[PDB]
Design a protein around this ligand. Structure first.
Ligand SMILES: CCCOc1cc2c(cc1\C(C)=C/C=C/C(C)=C/C(=O)O)C(C)(C)CCC2(C)C
Ligand SMILES: CCCOc1cc2c(cc1\C(C)=C/C=C/C(C)=C/C(=O)O)C(C)(C)CCC2(C)C
Lengths: 213, 12, 213, 12
């Protein structure tokens, strides 16, 4: 079973600008662990597979969360620390292009379709249950969980938004953008560490340990 | 061996 | 209108190993233009938007095609030139990791679910009609075309495979893997050109012209 | 200015 009520409850329970962004991301990695523990059946996976899924998905999972948090912000994002990052500030820090991708491909699209927190939570749970993550002890088990999430999400969409038959597909089709943006953010983070001019806290730093890609 | 993540996952 | 019969017809109409792969990719870029012209309404977009969509999607579109072509091949892919590339050969050429991602995340998954050519064609048309492509004169127009493709694909899946309610979602959820793999292949191609030890033909080389990313 | 792609798209 994979009830969307549990997924929403998980969202509601966890309810240099680049330095501020790194500080917020490290903070939210702790909260991400507590969120995942609230997603049905995640905690019943083998401990090493829980590690794999979170190491593989953390950047997309965090991006989805702060993007949805920012749907009412104009030309900016709300960090979990209560700070706002304006697109002019991101641009002034040398990360304007990828920041604009988040605003254009994620935040604005979430705003335009009024993606709700149940839908957000379900998309994040799909990202979490990534059966292509390398090293999983039982990929089919993770694929089965992803399939239960999407089945539940579609039923929710069809019941709450029956006038929008394409809505379920529209939600899923933000995931390629999320994957591209997540990959680019990781590239930036490896550069920040290489140059050494940006503090990176311990949990964020641990995500940079091998394995990579 | 992903020390922080393991510790946070294993606890209650 | 966006009938899946036209999309299938488009597929059927176009029905150092790294050097062999580069030669095949250049050859298939010409065929990709002829395929796109056969996808309903693509040719009615402004010429500059046709250019944008193909420049943005060529690598994912070609990867999807040779992956589906290879579903009956064991541990390898069939190039459009009639050559087979075995995973041992890819490994012996220094590109084993990304080759294995194609086999594992795309070819095997297409084989496991017996993805058919209508479904392949529809997924490629969704990739083609990418409304996030930078520079489009009318993104909403491209988004509308993508929505017509997915609506048609879902109806096809529900009619042909009614016993598999999750099949439409399962097809869409190979697109994040396709996007990641496509991005990695492009990274390799820029390296091949930088080192200069791999011939790159004119159409493939033109895809490397700016703009990038 | 993407010479080959334009030529192939514009033709019949
Ligand atoms: C962390 C550093 C590398 O990862 C990132 C780098 C960047 C970004 C995000 C992340 C990620 C992956 C997560 C951010 C999470 C936060 C900030 C969550 C929150 O507050 O709830 C955005 C905001 C798109 C701006 C561009 C750069 C390249 C600086
Ligand atoms: C072209 C060179 C950069 O793009 C690629 C590079 C690579 C690959 C594919 C592509 C792409 C994007 C397309 C290939 C199309 C073909 C070969 C089509 C066909 O015959 O119909 C695979 C096969 C995954 C092996 C790994 C490397 C890195 C060598």
């Amino acid at each position: 079973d994979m009830p969307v009520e549990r997924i929403l409850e998980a969202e509601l329970a966890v309810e240099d600008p680049v330095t501020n962004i790194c500080q917020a991301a490290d903070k939210q990695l702790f909260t991400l662990v507590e969120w995942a523990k609230r997603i049905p059946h995640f905690s019943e996976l083998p401990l090493d597979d829980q590690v794999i899924l979170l190491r593989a998905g953390w950047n997309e999972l965090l991006i989805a969360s702060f993007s949805h948090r920012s749907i009412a912000v104009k030309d900016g994002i709300l960090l979990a620390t209560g700070l706002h990052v304006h697109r002019n500030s991101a641009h002034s820090a040398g990360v304007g292009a990828i920041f604009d991708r988040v605003l254009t491909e994620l935040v604005s699209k979430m705003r335009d379709m009024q993606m709700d927190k149940t839908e957000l939570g379900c998309l994040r749970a799909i990202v979490l249950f990534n059966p292509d993550s390398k090293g999983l002890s039982n990929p089919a088990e993770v694929e089965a969980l992803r399939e239960k999430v999407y089945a539940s999400l579609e039923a929710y969409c069809k019941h709450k938004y029956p006038e929008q038959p394409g809505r379920f597909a529209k939600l899923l089709l933000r995931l390629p953008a999320l994957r591209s943006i997540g990959l680019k953010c990781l590239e930036h983070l490896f550069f920040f560490k290489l140059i050494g001019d940006t503090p990176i806290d311990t949990f964020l730093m641990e995500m940079l340990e091998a394995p990579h890609q | 061996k992903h020390k922080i993540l393991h510790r946070l996952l294993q606890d209650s």
